[PDB]
Structure formats: structure tokens, C-alpha cells
Enzyme design. Structure first.
Site, PDB file in Angstrom:
ATOM      1  N   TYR A  51      12.285  35.128  64.842  1.00 14.75           N
ATOM      2  CA  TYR A  51      13.284  34.077  65.002  1.00 14.75           C
ATOM      3  C   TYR A  51      14.689  34.658  64.932  1.00 14.75           C
ATOM      4  O   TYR A  51      15.601  34.062  64.343  1.00 14.75           O
ATOM      5  CB  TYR A  51      13.108  32.969  63.974  1.00 14.75           C
ATOM      6  CG  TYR A  51      13.623  31.621  64.411  1.00 14.75           C
ATOM      7  CD1 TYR A  51      13.000  30.915  65.438  1.00 14.75           C
ATOM      8  CD2 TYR A  51      14.701  31.027  63.767  1.00 14.75           C
ATOM      9  CE1 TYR A  51      13.443  29.667  65.810  1.00 14.75           C
ATOM     10  CE2 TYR A  51      15.155  29.777  64.140  1.00 14.75           C
ATOM     11  CZ  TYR A  51      14.516  29.103  65.157  1.00 14.75           C
ATOM     12  OH  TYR A  51      14.964  27.863  65.524  1.00 14.75           O
TER      13      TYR A  51
ATOM     14  N   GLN B 129      16.754  35.937  70.277  1.00 11.69           N
ATOM     15  CA  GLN B 129      15.869  35.582  71.383  1.00 11.69           C
ATOM     16  C   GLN B 129      14.792  34.605  70.934  1.00 11.69           C
ATOM     17  O   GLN B 129      14.523  33.613  71.617  1.00 11.69           O
ATOM     18  CB  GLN B 129      15.253  36.823  72.032  1.00 11.69           C
ATOM     19  CG  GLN B 129      16.247  37.664  72.805  1.00 11.69           C
ATOM     20  CD  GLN B 129      16.801  36.984  74.062  1.00 11.69           C
ATOM     21  OE1 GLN B 129      16.127  36.212  74.741  1.00 11.69           O
ATOM     22  NE2 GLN B 129      18.035  37.316  74.395  1.00 11.69           N
TER      23      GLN B 129
ATOM     24  N   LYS C  43       6.478  35.668  58.446  1.00 15.09           N
ATOM     25  CA  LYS C  43       5.844  35.834  57.144  1.00 15.09           C
ATOM     26  C   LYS C  43       6.331  34.747  56.182  1.00 15.09           C
ATOM     27  O   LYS C  43       7.394  34.144  56.367  1.00 15.09           O
ATOM     28  CB  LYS C  43       6.132  37.228  56.585  1.00 15.09           C
ATOM     29  CG  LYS C  43       7.587  37.504  56.347  1.00 15.09           C
ATOM     30  CD  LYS C  43       7.792  38.881  55.764  1.00 15.09           C
ATOM     31  CE  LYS C  43       9.159  38.976  55.131  1.00 15.09           C
ATOM     32  NZ  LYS C  43      10.234  38.654  56.112  1.00 15.09           N
TER      33      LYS C  43
ATOM     34  N   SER D 106       9.935  34.786  54.802  1.00 17.37           N
ATOM     35  CA  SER D 106      11.019  35.053  55.734  1.00 17.37           C
ATOM     36  C   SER D 106      12.235  34.185  55.451  1.00 17.37           C
ATOM     37  O   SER D 106      12.126  32.973  55.261  1.00 17.37           O
ATOM     38  CB  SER D 106      10.542  34.763  57.147  1.00 17.37           C
ATOM     39  OG  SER D 106      11.623  34.798  58.058  1.00 17.37           O
TER      40      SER D 106
ATOM     41  N   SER E  54      14.211  33.215  57.601  1.00 21.24           N
ATOM     42  CA  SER E  54      14.385  32.305  58.720  1.00 21.24           C
ATOM     43  C   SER E  54      13.551  31.032  58.607  1.00 21.24           C
ATOM     44  O   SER E  54      13.828  30.073  59.334  1.00 21.24           O
ATOM     45  CB  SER E  54      14.025  33.013  60.026  1.00 21.24           C
ATOM     46  OG  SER E  54      14.935  34.047  60.305  1.00 21.24           O
TER      47      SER E  54
ATOM     48  N   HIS F 141      10.754  43.237  75.625  1.00 10.99           N
ATOM     49  CA  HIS F 141      11.128  44.576  76.064  1.00 10.99           C
ATOM     50  C   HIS F 141       9.858  45.398  76.221  1.00 10.99           C
ATOM     51  O   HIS F 141       8.808  45.053  75.677  1.00 10.99           O
ATOM     52  CB  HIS F 141      12.051  45.261  75.063  1.00 10.99           C
ATOM     53  CG  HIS F 141      13.399  44.646  74.991  1.00 10.99           C
ATOM     54  ND1 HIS F 141      14.334  44.792  75.992  1.00 10.99           N
ATOM     55  CD2 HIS F 141      13.967  43.862  74.047  1.00 10.99           C
ATOM     56  CE1 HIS F 141      15.422  44.121  75.664  1.00 10.99           C
ATOM     57  NE2 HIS F 141      15.233  43.560  74.483  1.00 10.99           N
TER      58      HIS F 141
ATOM     59  N   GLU G 111      45.295  51.782  72.085  1.00 10.30           N
ATOM     60  CA  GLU G 111      45.334  52.276  73.451  1.00 10.30           C
ATOM     61  C   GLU G 111      43.989  52.766  73.968  1.00 10.30           C
ATOM     62  O   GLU G 111      43.861  52.929  75.196  1.00 10.30           O
ATOM     63  CB  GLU G 111      46.401  53.366  73.599  1.00 10.30           C
ATOM     64  CG  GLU G 111      47.803  52.848  73.329  1.00 10.30           C
ATOM     65  CD  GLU G 111      48.072  51.544  74.055  1.00 10.30           C
ATOM     66  OE1 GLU G 111      48.150  51.583  75.286  1.00 10.30           O
ATOM     67  OE2 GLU G 111      48.143  50.477  73.399  1.00 10.30           O
TER      68      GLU G 111
ATOM     69  N   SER H 286      47.635  47.918  86.279  1.00 12.80           N
ATOM     70  CA  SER H 286      48.794  48.418  86.996  1.00 12.80           C
ATOM     71  C   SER H 286      48.428  49.586  87.908  1.00 12.80           C
ATOM     72  O   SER H 286      47.429  50.268  87.713  1.00 12.80           O
ATOM     73  CB  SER H 286      49.859  48.885  86.009  1.00 12.80           C
ATOM     74  OG  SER H 286      49.447  50.096  85.397  1.00 12.80           O
TER      75      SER H 286
HETATM   76 CL   LIG Z   1      19.855  38.688  71.885  1.00 11.62          CL
HETATM   77 MG   LIG Z   2      47.533  50.745  77.024  1.00 14.06          MG
HETATM   78 MG   LIG Z   3      50.119  50.837  80.946  1.00 15.16          MG
HETATM   79 MG   LIG Z   4      17.213  47.923  73.744  1.00 13.40          MG
HETATM   80 MG   LIG Z   5      47.580  47.087  92.087  1.00 17.99          MG
END
Ligand SMILES: [Cl-]
Ligand SMILES: [Mg+2]
Ligand SMILES: [Mg+2]
Ligand SMILES: [Mg+2]
Ligand SMILES: [Mg+2]
Ligand SMILES: [Cl-]
Ligand SMILES: [Mg+2]
Ligand SMILES: [Mg+2]
Ligand SMILES: [Mg+2]
Ligand SMILES: [Mg+2]
Ligand SMILES: [Mg+2]
Ligand SMILES: [Mg+2]
Ligand SMILES: [Mg+2]
Ligand SMILES: [Mg+2]
Ligand SMILES: [Mg+2]
Ligand code: NA
Lengths: 325, 325
Positions: free
Chosen positions: A22, A25, A45, A48, A50, A105, A224, A249
Site C-alpha cells: 500500500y 502504486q 502484514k 503494518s 498502512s 516492475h 546555478e 536565453s
Molecule cells: Cl509511485
Molecule cells: Mg543561472
Molecule cells: Mg543566464
Molecule cells: Mg526502478
Molecule cells: Mg532563443
């Protein structure tokens, strides 16, 4: 690609679906399956954290073993490194011939951490967004695109069943791409290692280090290379490289075109290929599993080192200034 | 650092602010100045792409020269590569003794492309967020951290004037950091080239290429190095490396820690040091200015080459499946 008209929702509506786990997903799938008329139970379990949340959302919760015995489709959405033990202890002894074992997965099956029996289907439904987005789009009558794969199909209806499941969580509203467990997991690991969770962070850290070593203030260095990366990646997510380069830019664009290929050169790409080879040959996963078995010692050591990097010190201070964060 | 109590709004309220150029940061300056009781006019040529959105806000628009003549604070937001010509023809003769010349970035003054007269203040106010966010925060009674620099100060009040300007756009609500034109622009260009607009994109492209050359589908490659990067960078933007690594799976975290420093290494830093030297020594800027003078031929060629990358082909197809983008 597969769309709504390619999938029959009545198939999954006729199956008892157990969702093991839980997290993001498991939460999104279980609620959306129920909204789509599927009988759902969540497997957790007894202790849990959750469980109270599942119950507050009106869902029934039982142990993974109970849910596996009850269900026709067992969707495993527990953490990657926990699945093998849940499988061996709770799911495997309770699978019934003709059940379907689903994953989000491909890792556990592809690398042999879970070896499903011959008497079950084995499939994957993997939405290409975080659970919160999967759920939000579904509730709004839309969807997040999904990958689907069918690794074992002894009843011959595995793809139709997986597409029906995807339709029940909204995936076919956007589109479903068929792939394999192998391709899903090898590309996932590769991208995580070389770009998402390895390369980009090391590139940020390296630029920060170069600036600080050259005597520039750490605060400017943080802005930056890290703070300003969100706008760039947001633009790419929405419109690709073209959108981002049009928005920045001409100085940033020209500089990026000249300097990017100097930073990331042919040798960098060769090192990526080495990292891919160690995914494909099973050695990375072997090392991961061994570290888990030993108590995550190497993971925890590398975690501490990254947490103590100087970019973290200055970043916490600067993010404290940001009232929208 | 400087906050609201360090700045006197009545100073900028007594000045006529001419914003020359506009672009994505224009509203964050011009609308907030106006809300803060400052007289504003915007200087744009008749054909400027910014003219419609400026007129939609009810700002008075005239030629750059006419606005500079009216104004006693001239804030230059025009593209960095266009500023020198605007300055020489439209601004410089219209800076009366005691006027102030302001910028949002340090490039033109630091690299000598603009040489201000001796009888004006020269300063910079640089909000550290996208214009839309800077403006939204201001409207909500909040702000975004800003940088402030004072490069020339004949009247001795330049810092007070710049902080007053920053207060009028919300910067002192969150915190103003003092810097220099030199440090702002060298760190900006360095970060753009090595990370924001060069390195990250070339890393993404290289990873994509490795996957598709190994036979994996372009669609999976796009997701696993580009699409999924937004979640990662959003997590870092909000909570640094630590938050992101805590939020991704053990497999992703461990893989990143091991493989990141293999992809980006000491060799990468040396190449970054060369890029930095070419920023510091003026040669990058010289090459940029020469390319602009010649018709942007090298920029346009590199733009076309990047636009043709295979990640752009598959990305357009997949983003078309996503309604939320
Ligand atoms: Cl996810
Ligand atoms: Mg910058
Ligand atoms: Mg810049
Ligand atoms: Mg992965
Ligand atoms: Mg441009
Ligand atoms: Cl604030
Ligand atoms: Mg409660
Ligand atoms: Mg019970
Ligand atoms: Mg039964
Ligand atoms: Mg992935
Ligand atoms: Mg008018
Ligand atoms: Mg003069
Ligand atoms: Mg003096
Ligand atoms: Mg290091
Ligand atoms: Mg020079
Ligand atoms: Na003037």
C-alpha cells in the site's frame, strides 16, 4: 499501442484482485480497481503501519498469504527488495493453478529473485507516473500511460487480463505499450543509474565543487546548478529539448550546445555501456541483494556520504528562505 | 543578507522606472513595481514579441529611447546579446547625471559589452525563480530570494536604491543576498553550460542512445532517462539530494550511488574547469557576440542538429499521450 477499445473491462471485473502493498502504486491501483467495479483486497502484514489507512478508505485488508489464497489475480507492489521474501513465505504456498501473478516492475522475475510456478500467469502493469498522478488522472476520467508485459501465459488470456486491469486503472485511456519484463527492468535500472539517480546528481555535485574550489560563493553555486535545474527539466518534460532550448536565453542555449558535448563525451558513453553490461549480466542485482542480506551496510554508508556533501549544507539554508517549498 | 526592515520603499517610489525589454521576467519586475507605487514604462520596438503581453497589462509602452529619456532608473531586461546595441543607441545618451542603470544579470557590464558613463549608478537585482513564481509570490504577500549587486555608485546611495527596488518586487520578504556582477554572471554561465543546458541534456541523450543502440525500444528509453527525471529534480529542488534519495527505491538509490561516480568523475571536473576558464577569460562571450554579428549561423546549426536527435521524435509521440502536459 492499446487503447480503451482494445481492452474488455468485464474480464478484470470478474476476478478477485489482491493488491500486496500500500505504497503509492498500491494505493492508486486498489482505489481505482474498486471504482471500476473490481472486488479488491489489500495484503499487508498484521502490524503494518498502512493497515489503518486502508481501512479508512473502506478497503478490506488481510495478510499477503490470505489475499493470495483468496485472489484470482495477485498484484505485488511491495518494495523491490522485500518481494522475494513475501513471495517465498506468503504467496508461493498459496497460489492456485490458473491464478495470475502481477507485478509493477520486471526486476524480481527477470533476475530470478522470484521464480513463479508453471501453473500461474505472470504479467506486469507499470504506469508511467507516480501513484498520486495515476489516481488523480483516473478520478478525473483520464489516465496515465502504462507498460504491460506477459511473461507466462498458460491459460492464453494473460494479455487480455493485463489490458483489462490497465483499463480498470485508467491506463488504456492514455495508451498501453506492450514490452517484456527484461526490457522494462534493464532500461529502468540503466536510466536510474546513469541519469536519474546517479549521473545527474554527480554532475550537479561536480559543478558545485568546481565553483566552490574556484572561490565562488556556495550560495551562488547552489542556485546555478541545482535550484535552476527544475525549470529546465519541467520544460523538457512538457515539450522536449526543443521547448526548453527555445525558452532559455540564446547565451544559455549556445553555451549548452558547445559545452554539453565537452562535459559528456564519447568516453562517458562508453562508461554507460559498462554500467548497462553489469545490469544485463546480473552482477549489479547480485550485489544489491547481498547488501540487503547483510543489513544494507554499503547502501547506508553511501547514503551518509551524499547526505553530508557541502551542497546539502548550503541547500538546506537556502531552501529555508523559500516560502513556497 | 537584507530583509524588509533594511530597505525603504519610498526611495524607489520616488523614481521613474523604465523597463527596457521584457521577456519572461518582465511581469515580475513591472507589475510588482506598479503595485508597490512605482511609475513604470516599458521600452520595446514596434515589432517586439513582448508588446502584446505588456499592453494587455496596461503598461505604457514606447521606444527604448523614449522610455530611457523619461526614466531615471533604467532596468534592462532585453536579451543579453541585444543589450549592447540598445544601450549604445537608446540608453547611454538618455542617462542624465544621477540616473541609475539596472540589470537582472551581470554579463554585459562584466564582460565590457556595456561601459556605463561615470555619472550613473549601476546595479543588479536578480530574483531567483521563474518570473511567474516571483510574481505569484509577490501577489500572495510573499517573495522569492534575490541577488543584489552594485557596480558603480557615484551618489553613495546605490545599495539603498537597489534594496528599495528589491523590496518593491518582493525580494526582501524572503531575503536578499549581496553579490557582484562578475560572480553572478560567471557562475550563471558556468552552471548553464556544465549542468542546466549542456551537461544534463547530453547525459540524457547519451543514455537514450546507449539503450536504442542496444536494441531496447525508443519509447522505454525516453521514459527511463527523460520523463522520469522531473520527479527526481522536483524532489531535489524541495529537499536536496537527501530527500530525493530517501524517496526513490533502494534499487534506484544504491544504483545511483555506485554508478553515478562512474559516469561523472574527476575527468569530468577537469573538462568543467576548462569550460570555466573560457567563461572567465571572455573567449566564450567573444565567440557568442561574433556569432550573433554573423547572423547566428553557428547557433542555428547546432540548434538544428539537436532538434533532430531521435529522443525528440519519440518524445513528441509519447507526450501526445499525456493530457496533463
Ligand atoms: Cl509511485
Ligand atoms: Mg543561472
Ligand atoms: Mg543566464
Ligand atoms: Mg526502478
Ligand atoms: Mg532563443
Ligand atoms: Cl517570503
Ligand atoms: Mg485521521
Ligand atoms: Mg484479518
Ligand atoms: Mg476463489
Ligand atoms: Mg525508471
Ligand atoms: Mg502609450
Ligand atoms: Mg552622459
Ligand atoms: Mg564616490
Ligand atoms: Mg565525489
Ligand atoms: Mg574581456
Ligand atoms: Na534617463
Amino acid at each position: 499501442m492499446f487503447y480503451d477499445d482494445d481492452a474488455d473491462l468485464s474480464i478484470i471485473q470478474g476476478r478477485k484482485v489482491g493488491v500486496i502493498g500500500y505504497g503509492s502504486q498500491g494505493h492508486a491501483h486498489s482505489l481505482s480497481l474498486r471504482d471500476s467495479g473490481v472486488q479488491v483486497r489489500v495484503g499487508l502484514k498484521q502490524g503494518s503501519r498502512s493497515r489503518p489507512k486502508v481501512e479508512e478508505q473502506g478497503l478490506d485488508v488481510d495478510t499477503p498469504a490470505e489475499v493470495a489464497k483468496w485472489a484470482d489475480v495477485v498484484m505485488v507492489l511491495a518494495p523491490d527488495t522485500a518481494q522475494a521474501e513475501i513471495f517465498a513465505g506468503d504467496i508461493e504456498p498459496n497460489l492456485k493453478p490458473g491464478d495470475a501473478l502481477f507485478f509493477g516492475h520486471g526486476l524480481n522475475v527477470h533476475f530470478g529473485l522470484i521464480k513463479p510456478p508453471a501453473d500461474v500467469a505472470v504479467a506486469m502493469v507499470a504506469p508511467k507516473g507516480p501513484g498520486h498522478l495515476v489516481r488523480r488522472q483516473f478520478v478525473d476520467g483520464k489516465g496515465v500511460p502504462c507498460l504491460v508485459a506477459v511473461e507466462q501465459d498458460p491459460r492464453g488470456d494473460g494479455l487480455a487480463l493485463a489490458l483489462s486491469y490497465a483499463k480498470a486503472i485508467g491506463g488504456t485511456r492514455a495508451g498501453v505499450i506492450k514490452t517484456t519484463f527484461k526490457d522494462e527492468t534493464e532500461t529502468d535500472l540503466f536510466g536510474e543509474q546513469t541519469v536519474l539517480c546517479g549521473g545527474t546528481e554527480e554532475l550537479v555535485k561536480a559543478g558545485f565543487e568546481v565553483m566552490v574550489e574556484a572561490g565562488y560563493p556556495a550560495e551562488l553555486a547552489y542556485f546555478e546548478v541545482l535550484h535552476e535545474l527544475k525549470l529546465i527539466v519541467d520544460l523538457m518534460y512538457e515539450g522536449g529539448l526543443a521547448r526548453m532550448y527555445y525558452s532559455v536565453s540564446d547565451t544559455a542555449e549556445f553555451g549548452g550546445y558547445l559545452s554539453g558535448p565537452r562535459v559528456i563525451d564519447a568516453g562517458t558513453k562508453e562508461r554507460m555501456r559498462d554500467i548497462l553490461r553489469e545490469i544485463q549480466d546480473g552482477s549489479f542485482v547480485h550485489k544489491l541483494v547481498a547488501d540487503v542480506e547483510g543489513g544494507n551496510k554499503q547502501l547506508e554508508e553511501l547514503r551518509r556520504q551524499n547526505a553530508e556533501h557541502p551542497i546539502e549544507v548550503v541547500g538546506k539554508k537556502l531552501r529555508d528562505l523559500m516560502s513556497w517549498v
